[PDB]
Amino acid sequence: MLKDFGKKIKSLRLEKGLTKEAVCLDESQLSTRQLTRIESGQSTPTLNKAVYIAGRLGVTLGYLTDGE
Amino acid sequence: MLYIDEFKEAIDKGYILGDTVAIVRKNGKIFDYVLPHEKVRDDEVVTVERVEEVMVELDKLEHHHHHH
């Protein structure tokens, strides 16, 4: 995933009024610590974590990759 | 869920310095790392482990395991 992904998902999450806990749920795919690191750019998201986040935020993967 | 590339990134970028790091294991297996001032939940099992041994254990996941 490219570095703009973290910027997109942070702003989208905040816009929707969702917590990091609401995105990560049982955390088997992503812990709240891990999501925080992705949103700041500290950590690059794996593809599997990225598609998990997209589903939780209610958008397709292509939307967050801008069709790339 | 934590794989080798994510862990190596944290080392290479300087988020994990030195020879040991806090590790969360869930169901016995490496689940996440924990950095200073990140929050741990009461039912997470946390252990200070040697970075080089975490690397070896995570690299096991990268090897091909054939099955019939």
Numbering used by the authors:
A (entry chain B), B (entry chain A): 1 to 68
Article excerpt on this structure:
Within S. pyogenes, Prx functions to inhibit the quorum-sensing receptor-signal pair ComRS, the master regulator of natural competence, or the ability to uptake endogenous DNA. ComR is a quorum-sensing receptor and a transcription factor that belongs to the Rgg subgroup of the RRNPP protein family, many of which regulate virulence in pathogenic Streptococcus species. ComR is a monomer that contains a DNA-binding domain (DBD) packed against a tetratricopeptide repeat (TPR) domain. Specifically, Prx binds directly to the apo-form of ComR preventing DNA binding in vitro and acts as a repressor of the S. pyogenes competence regulon in vivo.
Despite not being able to obtain an X-ray crystal structure of Prx in complex with full-length ComR, we were able to cocrystallize Prx with the DBD of ComR. DBD:Prx cocrystals were obtained with both purified minimal DBD bound to Prx and after in situ proteolysis with full-length ComR complexed with Prx. In the case of the proteolysis experiment, full-length ComR was cleaved within the linker region that joins the DBD to the TPR. Analysis of the DBD:Prx complex interface reveals that Prx directly interacts with the DNA-binding surface of ComR. The interaction is highly electrostatic in nature, with Prx using a large negative surface consisting of conserved acidic residues to complement the conserved positive DNA-interaction face of the ComR DBD. At this interface, Prx makes several hydrogen bond and salt-bridge contacts with key residues in the DBD that are critical for interaction with DNA. If the DBD:Prx complex is aligned to apo-ComR using the DBD, we observed that Prx is unable to interact with the DNA-binding residues of ComR due to a large steric clash as this surface is held tightly against the TPR domain. As such, to bind ComR, Prx must induce a conformational change in apo-ComR to interact with the DBD.
